[PDB]
A paper describes a structure:
Therefore, we prepared another form of MuPEP1 with the four N-terminal residues truncated (tMuPEP1), a form that was found to be crystallized in a different space group from that of MuPEP1. We also tested several synthetic analogs of Compound 1 and revealed the structure of tMuPEP1 in complex with Compound 2 at a 3.1 Å resolution. The electron density of v-shaped Compound 2 was clearly observed in a pocket composed of β-strand (Phe63–Lys69), α-helix (Asp71–Tyr77), loop (Asn78–Pro83), Ala70, and the side chain of Phe137. The binding is mainly mediated through hydrophobic and van der Waals interactions. A few hydrogen bonds might also contribute, but the interactions cannot be specified at this resolution. Although the physiological function of this relatively hydrophobic pocket is unknown, the residues interacting with Compound 2 are conserved among Streptococcus PEPs (dots). The side chain of Arg66 occupies the vacant space of this binding pocket in free tMuPEP1, whereas it is rotated away to avoid steric hindrance with Compound 2 in the tMuPEP1-Compound 2 complex. Superimposition of the acyl-intermediate model and the tMuPEP1-Compound 2 complex structure showed direct collision between the bound inhibitor and some residues lining the pocket. Taken together, the following inhibition mechanism is proposed: After substrate binding, PEP catalysis proceeds via an acyl-intermediate-like transition state in which a pocket on the protein surface is compressed. When an inhibitor binds to this pocket, the inhibitor prevents the structural changes and non-competitively inhibits the PEP activity.
The ComABCDE pathway is the quorum-sensing system in some species of Streptococcus, such as S. mutans and S. pneumoniae, in which autoinducer peptides are processed from the precursor ComC and concomitantly exported to the extracellular space by ComA and ComB6, 7. PEP is a highly specific peptidase belonging to a cysteine protease family. We believe that PEP of ComA is a more suitable target for inhibitor development for the following reasons: First, PEP catalyzes the initial step of the quorum-sensing system of Streptococcus. In this study, we focused on PEP as the target of potential inhibitors of the Streptococcus quorum-sensing pathway, established a reliable high-throughput screening system using a synthetic substrate for PEP, and successfully obtained a compound that was found to allosterically inhibit PEP and suppress the quorum-sensing pathway, which eventually led to attenuated biofilm formation.
Residue numbers in the entry:
A (entry chain A): 6 to 141
B (entry chain B): 6 to 25, 39 to 140
The structure:
């Protein structure tokens, strides 16, 4: 699971983006994506992630789902989620898949990176917003 | 229920801040929840933000009014004002000038809400 850790506090949005591109081929510098995604001091908005994704030639959709979303096997990984971690309100993960009760996620937090996560935990952080991407 | 409707598709954050003009690190995409907070702190507010679920509305302490981050269709950084939980239905304010204040079912609200609530007091 090819994931790009962040470094500046604000980078999480650019980072999940780039993590996604790598997977589906492309490479892209985070400072660039900062400027594309209109990431500012307080991270990126959900919107910013989208516009950007579109401009890298991605077919983007976003939805409000609930946990049941993960009961459906055609779910095309990877994709992005908006989550809340403690005081980080504009955080995001990459979702790679799910062997077991558990999700394979990538937290651009360089101290976490890719990791398994329980669904209780995930539910409790996840905003319901998912952003699905595929190349055009 | 004092609510200030918005004008541009971006003002929704400033608009909910209207809580009893033009500001606060609000860029071309509405705002971040972060921005709403900082701002609220300016204006002299004590700000508590938390991830909740619907059980939150089971709380008799619940200090209305307060703010929520919700998704409306493809408006991903939208927000409402929550005025009260008078029964199985909520009193909300949608800065969307075509909606403004309105009752809302909890199934509907659950379906739009991101879980994020931001509580303010002077
Ligand atoms: C600043 C004004 C609000 N201050 C505040 O501390 O929170 C408002 C109320 C609601 C409720 C009772 C007292 N206080 C905090 C309480 C609450 C509910 C919840 C809650 C947390 C998680 C939930 O789902 C996962 C649900 C509710 N947390 N908390 C702290």
């Amino acid at each position: 699971y090819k994931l790009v850790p962040q470094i500046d506090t604000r980078d999480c949005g650019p980072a999940v983006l780039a993590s996604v591109a790598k997977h589906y081929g492309s490479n892209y510098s985070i400072a660039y994506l900062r400027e594309l995604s209109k990431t500012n001091k307080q991270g990126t908005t959900a919107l910013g992630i989208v516009e950007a994704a579109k401009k890298l030639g991605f077919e983007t959709r976003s939805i409000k789902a609930d946990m049941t979303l993960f009961d459906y096997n055609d779910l095309t990984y990877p994709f992005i989620v908006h989550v809340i971690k403690g005081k980080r309100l504009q955080h995001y993960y990459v979702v790679y898949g799910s062997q077991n009760n558990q999700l394979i996620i990538g937290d651009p937090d360089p101290s976490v990176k890719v990791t398994r996560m329980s669904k209780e935990r995930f539910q409790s952080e996840w905003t319901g917003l998912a952003i699905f991407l595929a190349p055009q």
